[PDB]
Amino acid sequence: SIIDQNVQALFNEISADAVFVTYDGQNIKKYGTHLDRAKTAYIPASTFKIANALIGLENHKATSTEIFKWDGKPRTVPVYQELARRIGPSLMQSELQRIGYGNMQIGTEVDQFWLKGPLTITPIQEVKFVYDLAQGQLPFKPEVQQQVKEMLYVERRGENRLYAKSGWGMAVDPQVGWYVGFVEKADGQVVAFALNMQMKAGDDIALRKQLSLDVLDKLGVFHY
Structure with missing residues (x-):
């Protein structure tokens, strides 16, 4: 109660429209300024990198050494677009369906x-x-x-x-x-x-990380 409350107090300090969902295998918990965001669908953007890498490695379209190497070039970090293209639409579609990722639609x-x-x-x-x-x-x-x-x-x-x-x-x-x-x-x-929040152009690039770490700290889950 008091920890959840203390986390909710944190979201007073910033005017962003946001949610922070945690999952421990049993319970979903929701914190933030706009809890509806938890069950709202949005484009994954580079969070997709997680599925792309898995699918790429499983179907032998890249090795992990190759992906790790591409990720570490002087350069945030984006999806490895060449790998997505090696997977190709047909396989990507069927793999996303197979694993149940989001709405599973790639067009x-x-x-x-x-x-x-x-x-x-x-x-x-x-x-x-x-x-x-x-x-x-x-x-x-x-x-x-x-x-x-x-x-x-x-x-x-x-x-x-x-x-x-x-x-x-x-x-x-x-x-x-x-x-x-x-x-x-x-x-x-x-x-x-x-963390899911509305962004603007010109927003601080570091805020998503810093807000997440502050929540994880207040939650007792991780002390950065």
């Missing part, structure tokens, strides 16, 4: 469907997806799930490990901002999370 010959639509996904879907990833519970090779996990690795605090992916849909209006991830605790326990 027909849409180049960057994660940026333009028609693909969308709720925060609640996002947070359950990366939870499944964290626990090896997606229908992919365990090795593939582990190597996608490590692509998302941000930070360690003790043996509490933070994993995250940011997104910013600049081509939809209103624009959408994502910070999706999970904290894998030292014991083994996992708390998945999703």
Whole structure:
């Protein structure tokens, strides 16, 4: 109660339209200025990178070394567009259906469907997806799930490990901002999370991360 309250107090300090969803395998919890956002569908933007990498590796369209290398070039970080193209529309479509990702619609010959639509996904879907990833519970090779996990690795605090992916849909209006991830605790326990907020042009690039970390701190889940 008092922790939930204290988190709710935090969202007074900023005027952004936002939700923060957590999932621990059992309960969805929702915090923020506009809780309706949790069950609203938005374009994944670069959060799609999570599905693209999994699908690419599972169907032998890239190795993890190749993806890790592409991700680390002098250069945020976007979907590996060449890999999406190697997967191709037919396979992407059937793989997204197979795994149940968002609305599972990519259109027909849409180049960057994660940026333009028609693909969308709720925060609640996002947070359950990366939870499944964290626990090896997606229908992919365990090795593939582990190597996608490590692509998302941000930070360690003790043996509490933070994993995250940011997104910013600049081509939809209103624009959408994502910070999706999970904290894998030292014991083994996992708390998945999703920041979803409305973005503007000229907004601070660092705010999604910093707001998420402040929530995770208040929640007792991770102390950056």
